[model samples]
Target: ASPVKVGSKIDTEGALLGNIILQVLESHGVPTVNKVQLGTTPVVRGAITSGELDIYPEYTGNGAFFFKDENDAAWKNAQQGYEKVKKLDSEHNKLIWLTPAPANNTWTIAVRQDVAEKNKLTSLADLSRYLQEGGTFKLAASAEFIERADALPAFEKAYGFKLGQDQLLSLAGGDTAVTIKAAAQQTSGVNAAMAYGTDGPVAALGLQTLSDPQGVQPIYAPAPVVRESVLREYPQMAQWLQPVFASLDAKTLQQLNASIAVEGLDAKKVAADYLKQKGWT
Candidate 1:
């Protein structure tokens, strides 16, 4: 019998959840091999689809692009996205998706708490209204957030607002830390920043996220994707990991990411400590 090969994307949340999955399987008496952080999503997803890996953590939202065009808005809803991925992957790729975590790590616009409170901007619609009234506004974001059709363009369309070049400070890399910090510090007139829903600094840097009433971004809850052959052999793996993932809400993941990113903690050690506290390992 082949070992259960696990893999994940080379990102903060990916590494955290990947190690958690690896540790959970190890504790459950399964011979699991860790190939987590092998590369980006495309590489990891390809590995799993081509039978090079047996299991890995994947976001259901990717399915909208993986199996169909991302322009489809159905991926914006969590339940619909999960169902689309679960049914299609089973039929096409011979893979099974385990339960997803109760967290959505999607893109969001965060403003400094002071700015948000002062402007009375609690949601994207409020921001739009403020902009429409010729209120002062400048945004800090990555180039992708500014240029991606699914990102700022979609938000503009959904909220009836458009940001001109003078209104946006576009950074080279998609680093939320720099963007959020610039917004927090009001660097060069930056008042709003691009951020992820579960990013650590949104809370640590006193940033307040604008509510997306229309849910423009796709839901990206993490879940284990396993080969059907491996799952058939070790059916208990899903049962063991489901409860573990269920415990990781958005705030929990943010803290975990902060510990690793800001505090410089080992990802594996954090995963181990979390499991030990939960009485799982």
Candidate 2:
């Protein structure tokens, strides 16, 4: 449900969610499953529908893409997103999409340390202030940066910030990471960039994320989507997963992401560490 599809291929692949499930199952003294094979969302949804798989994490926006008639810009917030998904599941065949974990999630604008310090910038307000003073700073962002309702236009509209098209450098989103790294290395043409909220490179590159008190970004939160059949079969299922997911806050989720992405550590260890800290070790 968060900004990034951290659980996009969760259970099927050896992703963080897959590892976490293994840990929880093992901790409960259940036999561990075999290697995970990546699968598509529709595939997983089909599995759950057919009573093959139990449950897994899902995002809010997927509802718009997955559910019809509810397609619109209204599914931007967590509550609305969850409700829409829940309604669709009910209408289709009845599925139980549970409550979301706490996370004020969104993509954001970021800048390298040199750019922020050299220009004396802190928040989005600072950028707006600079613009008012007639300062023209360049920005490097992915092609998706130019589009996506939640990308640049949403950001600018939220903060009332303006930038000329000439000020933009449309690079590959894949190349955006390298661009950010290079921006952090020196005074580059791009003074600003579009960044993911929990990109592992943020702290490593010493980048600064501008504050958005204006509430522009879309709301996304990780949630448990389970087939209603599973819940009816194992009525105790919600109780089993709810408390565990309660611990799946932004900090813990981000740290887990860091271990998998930055430290290249085992997802099991990352999940285990969080549980250990909470006496669930």
Candidate 3:
């Protein structure tokens, strides 16, 4: 069997999830090459499309624009996003999307635990209430979140809070790792930062995620997207991966992520341990 070429982005979650997929497929007797940590999303995505790679974990929200316009609101809802991606990608790119975990790993605002407890801010509504009663907010985010219509603007509109130019600490190429650390360290007077619901540091660094009562951002469920030809050749890959992904909810994913991101555990070890625990070995 020619080893299935697997790819992953260069992030902690990406490595963890990607290794999980690679290990699971390998355990099921599918030969796989660890072409993981290849680069960013665009690099891995391009590899998959050009047949340089066979499979990788992809976010549902990204699939919305993978075949069509990014501005389409259909990607905002979890079910709608996955369904459309499956339909469009199958029709256009011949990519097969497997079952996704029941986790909406979407964008979120994470605050310092002490700040959250002191202000009694549990949700976005509570933040709104805090601001209404004369509290302040300084946020750390990427330029995209501040500029994107579907990001910070949507959150502000939904939750009824606003930050001034000085209040918004925008980072160049600002990923969650940067934003989360900024908030954790109280850098530049930022009390909060942009984060994902399942980011490892959010739990590892002791941060609190504000509830999105109105669902401001789109849901991004993770699933293994494989080349159709590869799926047909190794039909069992689909069957084996489905149950593994189904077992990973948001909290489970977070804990798994923290193992690697915080405790410095290897992604392969984490993946192996998880499979052993589930008796999938």
In terms of lDDT, the best-performing candidate is 1
TM, every model: 0.85, 0.75, 0.83
List per-prediction Cα lDDT, in the order shown. Answer: 0.87, 0.62, 0.85
TM-score of model 1 relative to the true fold? 0.85
Q: Name the lDDT of candidate 1.
A: 0.87
The better candidate by TM-score, 2 or 3, is 3
The collision pairs in model 3 are: none
Error of 3 at 241 (Å): 1.7
lDDT of 3 by residue, 108-173 (tens): 888888889999988888987887787877888999999998888888898898878978899988
- Model 2, poorest ten-residue lDDT window? 1-10
Query: lDDT per residue, candidate 1, 140-251, as tens digits?
Result: 9999999999899999999999998889999999799999899988899998899887787777777877767687988888999999999999999989998898898776
State the displacement of the C-alpha of residue 174, model 2, in Å, after optimal TM-score superposition.
3.4
The model with the greater TM-score, 1 or 2, is: 1
Ranking by TM-score: 1, 3, 2
The sequence of per-residue lDDT tens digits that candidate 2 reaches over residues 110-156 is 77767677788877878878777888677777788777776788777
